[PDB]
Design a protein around this nucleic acid. Sequence first.
RNA 1: GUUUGGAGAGUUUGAUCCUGGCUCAGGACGAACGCUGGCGGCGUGCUUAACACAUGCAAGUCGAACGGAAAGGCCC
Length: 180
Amino acid sequence: NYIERVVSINRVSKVVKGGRRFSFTALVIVGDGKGMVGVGYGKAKEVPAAIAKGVEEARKNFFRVPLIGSTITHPVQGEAAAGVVMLRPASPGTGVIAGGAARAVLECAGVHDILAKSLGSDNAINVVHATVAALKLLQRPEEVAARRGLPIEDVAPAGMLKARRESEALAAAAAREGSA
RNA sequence: GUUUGGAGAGUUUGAUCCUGGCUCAGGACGAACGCUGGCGGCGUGCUUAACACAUGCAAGUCGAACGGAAAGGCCC
Ligand SMILES: [Mg+2]
Ligand SMILES: [Mg+2]
């Protein structure tokens, strides 16, 4: 099951000697809610065809979000095309505290608890791009440990190790219930 | 050491991105005004003229400091 959010529909227009030739653009976000998300921008003469092209471009651009539990690993600031988004991890229960465009990215990413603030341009297209830039700056503790050559207990905070442990237990629980 | 904690929307253009102001959704009050109005608990009430003030109260008490004797009391 893929969750699909249409963030914005924009009616654009070319000009010609005969008048204005209108077109539609759709910014579409597709994800599985398991830490995969893709962003697709589709444009066509009609709204449904624009959305459909957006869905396809999003699936072409699936990428993986490092998620410790139901939260991002560490605070990050992504900047793209004047868009600036700050992401901060939150404790369980906080919920998605995010603005409209960033909410669509993070919900489809399956982030359940996050604090997100937009600090630059309010243009939905560029806010989405900035949010993706931030999510690409997220690092896994496993990857930090390897890149540093140190063990995991040496590079990460004990409380993040703990939250890792419990999240692995719930993954095992779902595997037990699902294979039973 | 460390989680207990940040949401945005509209509006410059034929269309676009940016910059940038304006406006709105929240909360608060020693409040006022309009419509409406059942009860109780607990608070609270001149923000203006340190303007002017009828009337009654808001500082007395001690006979174990003292001479005394108007009111009571008791004794002729
Ligand atoms: Mg701005
Ligand atoms: Mg006064």
